[PDB]
């Protein structure tokens, strides 16, 4: 899962950049919120460890 997360976020960022350059404002607006959510998710590490997005020790928690 860790190896597979960066491609998703970066490819969505590519989508956002493309729609910016093409001047397609509506789609860019629809896509910015997910961009920021992914940014927050990747750069917060709510887990106290703060070394991996998914941590085997923190994983297996029901919440």
């Amino acid at each position: 899962l860790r190896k597979l997360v960066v491609p998703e976020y970066s490819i969505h960022g590519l989508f956002c950049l493309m729609f910016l350059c093409a001047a397609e404002w509506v789609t860019l607006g629809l896509n910015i919120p997910l961009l920021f959510y992914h940014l927050w998710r990747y750069f917060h590490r709510p887990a106290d460890g703060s070394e991996v997005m998914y941590d085997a020790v923190s994983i297996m928690n029901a919440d």
């Binding site: 590519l14 493309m18 350059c21 093409a22």
Partner: protein
């Protein structure tokens, strides 16, 4: 015409626009992109990214 009498016009004309003849424009920096439209260049960039 109120004080003299004219003939039918021997030459009809009207207002027109005079400009300086377009010259060979001094080549612009980045004139090497002119053979292809900007949209082609951007599609090239993003096709490179996608490939």
């Amino acid at each position: 015409e109120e004080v003299i009498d004219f003939s039918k016009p021997f030459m009809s004309l009207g207002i027109s626009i005079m400009i300086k003849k377009p010259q060979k424009s001094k080549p612009g920096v980045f004139s090497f992109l002119d053979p292809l439209a900007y949209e082609i260049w951007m599609c090239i960039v993003f096709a490179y990214i996608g490939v």
